[PDB]
């Protein structure tokens, strides 16, 4: 039971190349590093507010 996934490739002038991975061990610890996952969320640090602040309005009014 192989898994297929897309390789990192840059942009091009105005695509998809796959690679194959199979796990050979019984413990999830033995698996390769998870280097693909670029999700983020600055929210928790950059705006830890209770009341929402609208950018265009004055901060204190």
Partner 1 sequence: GDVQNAVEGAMVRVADTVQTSATNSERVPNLTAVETGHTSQAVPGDTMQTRHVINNHVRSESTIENFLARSACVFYLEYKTGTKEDSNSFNNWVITTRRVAQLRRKLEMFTYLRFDMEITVVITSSQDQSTSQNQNAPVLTHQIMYVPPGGPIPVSVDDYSWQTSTNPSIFWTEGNAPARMSIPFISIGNAYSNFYDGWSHFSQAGVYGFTTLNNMGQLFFRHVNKPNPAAITSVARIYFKPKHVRAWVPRPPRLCPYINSTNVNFEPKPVTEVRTNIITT
Partner 2 sequence: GLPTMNTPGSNQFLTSDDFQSPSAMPQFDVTPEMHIPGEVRNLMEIAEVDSVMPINNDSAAKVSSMEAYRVELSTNTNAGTQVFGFQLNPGAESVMNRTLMGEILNYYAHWSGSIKITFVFCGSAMTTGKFLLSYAPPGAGAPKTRKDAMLGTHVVWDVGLQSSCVLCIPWISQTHYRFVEKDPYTNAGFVTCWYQTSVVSPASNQPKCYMMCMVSACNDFSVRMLRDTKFIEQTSFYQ
Partner 3 sequence: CGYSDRVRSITLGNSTITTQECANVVVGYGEWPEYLSDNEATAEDQPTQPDVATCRFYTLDSVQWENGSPGWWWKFPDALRDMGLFGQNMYYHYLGRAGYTIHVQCNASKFHQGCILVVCVPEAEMGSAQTSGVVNYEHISKGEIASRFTTTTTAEDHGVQAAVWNAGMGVGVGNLTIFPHQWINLRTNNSATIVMPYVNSVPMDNMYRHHNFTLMIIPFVPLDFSAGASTYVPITVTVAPMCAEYNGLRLAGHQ
Residue 19 beta carbon to partner 1: minimum distance, rounded to whole angstroms: 9
Query: Rounded distance, CA 23 to CA 32, Å?
Result: 9
Q: Could you say which residues in the range 20-59 bind partner 3, by CB under 8 A?
A: 43-45, 48-51, 53-54, 57-59
Query: Rounded distance, CA 26 to CA 61, Å?
Result: 61
Binding site partner of 15, from partner 3, partner 2, a copy of itself, none, Cβ cut-off 5-8 A by kind: none
The SS3 assignment for 46 reads helix
Q: Does 60 bind partner 3 (CB under 8 A)?
A: yes
For residue 55, give both structure tokens.
């950018």
Q: Does 1 bind partner 2 (CB under 8 A)?
A: no
């Amino acid at each position: 039971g192989a898994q297929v996934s897309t390789q990192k490739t840059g942009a091009h002038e105005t695509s998809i190349i796959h690679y194959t991975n199979i796990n050979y061990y019984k413990d999830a610890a033995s698996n390769s590093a998870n280097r693909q996952d670029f999700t983020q969320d600055p929210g928790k640090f950059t705006e830890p507010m209770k009341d929402v602040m609208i950018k265009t309005l004055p901060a204190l009014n």
